[PDB]
Design a protein around this nucleic acid. Structure first.
Lengths: 89, 95, 104, 78, 88, 79, 103, 93
DNA sequence: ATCTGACACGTGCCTGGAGACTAGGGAGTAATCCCCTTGGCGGTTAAAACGCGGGGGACAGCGCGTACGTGCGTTTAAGCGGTGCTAGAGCTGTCTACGACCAATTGAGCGGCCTCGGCACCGGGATTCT
DNA sequence: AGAATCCCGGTGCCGAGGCCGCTCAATTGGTCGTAGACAGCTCTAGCACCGCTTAAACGCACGTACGCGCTGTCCCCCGCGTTTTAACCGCCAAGGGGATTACTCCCTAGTCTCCAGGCACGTGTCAGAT
């Protein structure tokens, strides 16, 4: 739609809620660190999920540039995959 | 405890120098002290790399001017270098 | 005239950028034109980003500079966008863009 | 627990970036790219922290692990 | 055409020639330098055209990934400028 | 004249290295535009290096430093 | 075994990288084991890229390693590719890639 | 008038690895620049870690952490184990 | 199969590297207060979860016209070679000026209190696309 | 015309601005030694003017590969309405482990001194380009 477009482009918020992101980040750091666990500082996960949110926003915006280049309106996953392959990562 | 170095107070008096009403919330103090740390790190890193490539061992005014004239974009470098040259000439107009 | 910051016109602490250029292993001999030059270019960059954030702050009918004004003032100009072209400003959001082919 | 970041939260992350219509197979793809990004950046954050003989991973270290990939974060004290 | 595709990939030469690139680079340095012309040392021009050829080949390959994405086979100029607009 | 002097089959040989099947006839002005922008960037950085060093002959090692700086580094010339 | 190279069991020099870690203003106090360790990691990277380029060099049947051998050995790995995803090898050529749909 | 290089050591590593092939001088130049580029990367990250932890030495554990940052998956693990075996055979003398 | 030439290899020497020992301070190791981060129970609810109708768009098709590869004379400047030059790169020799460095001195700038107002939020008028 | 969406007033509340006591690093003054800034000599190679060759750019004929605008089939996201559920605030409790100081062994800068590793010269012989 359009009203949630301008509502989510006006808002300064954080768009994935904090606690499932914290469970995700702690599981991935237990995968490293020779098996044993760590503990995060209270705004380390805030730094991490602001960076993850800004990376997903820029990735989807560049893939949607590719989609309305390609003569569509939607976002098929090969747009995300190919725009990730062109930016040099 | 521990004294911490921070550029909050200087950002605030440059702010009230520019337009004399608006104040800054503390997260913008945090963005501005991280910003002046990051620009200072870029210009000093280019400073040490030029004085390293050129087989010298000292950083002087000419070399920070070359670092600025490299790093910044089109017109921003021109007026930033003119600010540096007039600040240094007035500093040596006193001592 | 018993500081050197307030001798050289500026408002930034040229003394501690001299201390950081010494104690931050850049070069051995740092001449006393270099940190005054460096804090001059930093005071100019802070003055430009804060002029832009300030006129955006007077535009949205407010009297602070919160981080979203800082995103809109480093992105609604072009040379500062070419300087800061990769960073992520905290709590900033994005600038309002909707492409052409989308709109009915 | 990668499934925990919900499906309409991915939809709102899309609709911030100007998108109109979202496909159906996109959700496993964006969970994949999120898992790649998070695993690289906490690899570097863990490397800094377990270098410094410390266990609370501090936000200055995650700012450094964002700093070295070019995509540095402001506001948290780099 | 396929035979010159394979013959220009299997070769390892350089593709834009010596004197037109030297006159192009000397014009672009005459525009800077306050007017007063420098002396390009004659391996710096090989440095500069191997740099520019690496940039143009990576640009054309990424724009051609875009046009095999879009459905076509040719290479329109909007694909070049969009493959430059995505990569920064 | 000189920018329209880097020839058109040189552009399409550059393209057929990358693996392109059909070249549209309008690509040539945009690829001269992107070549001129690239050379303005790297020649501004090389000129500023070799004018800081007070050295009126542009070396090759400073062109390599200019490419090493903006991140498309070059191997072979004393990097 | 007076020189530290054949003390440390290596082939690169360790005096030269100790001189560079002192004179290249990285830090003041460069410890004892650090140039030896850094010469070891440089030796391993060089021995792996030259096993790869030497085997490509005898696969295309020439007796000597030329630059395109280095670019085939770099672009036909993936951890060496991620280490060198930016660099441009001069007189290098490209990797041969032609898709399936374009023909 | 001297000017230093790395060509002799690259040649000794090559004719250790497999003893037939030699190196044309442009490949000496390329991987001369490669050794110098990898050196500047690892020591720049060395200086940045030992400045971020308020420390003042570049020692072996710090170089080991810098190598495990910069290199990819297997290459970091086996380059670190090779370096640790070099430091053991040094510091046992 | 052969030549055109450069990579591989041999002696002088010479600048940098190793050895032996000094001298100061840096980082290891322990120790104590305490910040704050994990962990776990009420309770409110905002938002996630989901079934189905409904049109919006993805996709195959197709025929029309349009612009691009390729053949073939035909010209145009690139490239190599002489070959002569002189600008400016590079080395080097003093020599002053400027930056490390020490020792005391003193506000500058920082932690902490603390009271104060800008905006978050709520609530009400009013205006008005599609 | 149904929510949509802009001024304005009211109420509250938690961050900001500002004052205030205070360590500590930033200035001032003086010593000094070494690094870079000019003269001055060499002398390598970047420029350039012309000649001769010739590989490549080029202009068009033209045939057709193929871009693309309009066509219909079908499926598949979006929105709506009920369900349900796990985040979130708030409280509480408690125990790592951060941080910061006190001590001190040893680990590296530094300096004299001897010596050989490596570079810079020449000289050969076969590696590859057609």
């Amino acid at each position: 739609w359009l009203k949630e477009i301008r509502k989510l482009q006006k808002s300064t918020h954080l768009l994935i809620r904090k606690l499932p992101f914290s469970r995700l980040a702690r599981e991935i750091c237990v995968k490293f660190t020779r098996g044993v666990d760590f503990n995060w500082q209270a705004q380390a996960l805030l730094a991490l999920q602001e960076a993850a949110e800004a990376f997903l926003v820029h990735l989807f915006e560049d893939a949607y540039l590719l989609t309305l280049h390609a003569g569509r309106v939607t976002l098929f996953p090969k747009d995300v995959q190919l725009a990730r392959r062109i930016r040099g990562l | 405890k521990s004294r911490k170095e921070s550029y909050a107070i200087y950002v605030y008096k440059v702010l009230k120098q520019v337009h004399p009403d608006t104040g800054i919330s503390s997260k913008a103090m945090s963005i501005m002290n991280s910003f002046v740390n990051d620009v200072f790190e870029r210009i000093a890193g280019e400073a040490s790399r030029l004085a390293h490539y050129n087989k010298r061992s000292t950083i002087t005014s000419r070399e920070i001017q070359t670092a600025v004239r490299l790093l910044l974009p089109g017109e921003l470098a021109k007026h930033a270098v003119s600010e540096g040259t007039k600040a240094v000439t007035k500093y040596t107009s006193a001592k | 005239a018993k500081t050197r910051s307030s001798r050289a016109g500026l408002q930034f602490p040229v003394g501690r950028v001299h201390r950081l250029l010494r104690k931050g292993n850049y070069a051995e001999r740092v001449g006393a034109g270099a940190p005054v030059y460096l804090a001059a270019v930093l005071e100019y960059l802070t003055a430009e980003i804060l002029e832009l954030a300030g006129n955006a702050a007077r535009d949205n009918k407010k009297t602070r500079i919160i981080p979203r004004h800082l995103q809109l003032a480093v992105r609604n100009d072009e040379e500062l966008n070419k300087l800061l072209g990769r960073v992520t400003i905290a709590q900033g959001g994005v600038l309002p863009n909707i492409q052409s082919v989308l709109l009915p | 627990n990668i499934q925990g970041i919900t499906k309409p939260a991915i939809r709102r992350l899309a609709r911030r970036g100007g998108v109109k219509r979202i496909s159906g197979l996109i959700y496993e793809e964006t969970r994949g790219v999120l898992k790649v990004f998070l695993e690289n950046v906490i690899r570097d954050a863990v490397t800094y922290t377990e270098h410094a003989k410390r266990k609370t991973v501090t936000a200055m270290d995650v700012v450094y692990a964002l700093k070295r990939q070019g995509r540095t974060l402001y506001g948290f004290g780099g």
